[PDB]
Structure formats: C-alpha cells, structure tokens
Amino acid sequence: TVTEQGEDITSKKDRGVLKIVKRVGNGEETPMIGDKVYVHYKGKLSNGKKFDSSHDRNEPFVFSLGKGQVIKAWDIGVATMKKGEICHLLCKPEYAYGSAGSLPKIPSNATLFFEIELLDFKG
C-alpha cells in the first residue's frame, strides 16, 4: 500500500504511519521485540521546525523495541528497518501524541516527521 507520501506500514492500513526509505540497509534482519535498538533521528513538525534530534546530542537514542517505551509510530516503524537503513516516517497524531500533544515541543494534533537511521541492535 504505497501512497504519494509513502508506504502505509500500519496493521490497520489506516494511513497513520507512512514510510519512505532514503537509504537501504545492508543488514538482513529487522530487530526483534525486546532487542535493544540504537538509532539516530531528527524530528520536525509540519511547519518545518526541528523539535528534537539525537544528532544534536552526539550519541544515539536507545530503546527496547516493542515495549511501549516510545510512541506507537516508532514501535511500528523501527520494527521494519534493517541495520544501516535510513527512512522517513510520517506519524499521524493517533500514532504519536494525539489531541493533547506534549507541550512545549509537540503541539496538539501534530503530525510528526522523523528521519531515522538504524545504527545497531542487540538481543
């Protein structure tokens, strides 16, 4: 299910998380549930404003995949990636911070736009 804004990678095919591959990984497997995943990312709002980036801290963001440690769009999206891959993820609010948002950085009803690089993962 490939739209003009990317591939719908949701289980519901509700257009809530859309993915565009920017660089193919040479890795073969995706990370598994419970793996410790290492990424770099940059997040922007629909107005182009960068709200956060791991690159700006000069160390990776680390989380356990599929454990609800991150927004739903990330547990869905990162699970599709291979080592070395860079993707863009368009994350509708229902897969992110919803109607409330998370002020000051994330407004109400915000679609989030991430560029994510899967650096490594360990089981």
- How far is it, in rounded angstroms, from Cα 71 to Cα 24? 23
Q: Across the strands, what pairs with 118? A: 39
* Residue 41: alpha-carbon gap to chain centroid: 8
- How far is it, in rounded angstroms, from Cα 20 to Cα 35? 23
Answer yes or no: 61 catalytic: no
Q: How far is the CB of 73 from ligand 3JQ (least distance, A)?
A: 8
Which one of 71, 76, 106, 116 is the catalytic residue? 71
Answer yes or no: 41 catalytic: yes
Which one of 38, 63, 114, 121 is the catalytic residue? 114
CA distances from 114 to 21, 42, 49 (A): 12, 6, 12
> For ligand 3JQ, which is the closer residue by CB, 63 or 83?
63
Answer yes or no: 95 catalytic: no
* Residues 76, 94 contacting (CB under 8 angstroms): no
- The phi and psi torsions of 76 (rounded to 5 degrees) equal -70, -50
> For ligand 3JQ, which is the closer residue by CB, 28 or 116?
116
> For ligand 3JQ, which is the closer residue by CB, 83 or 116?
116
Residues lying near ligand 3JQ in the complex (CB under 6 A) are found at 43, 51-52, 61, 68, 70-71, 74, 97, 102, 105-106, 112
Q: How far is the CB of 54 from ligand 3JQ (least distance, A)?
A: 8
Which one of 38, 63, 97, 113 is the catalytic residue? 97
CA distances from 42 to 38, 48, 123 (A): 14, 11, 25
Q: Which residues are catalytic, by number?
A: 41, 51-52, 71, 97, 114
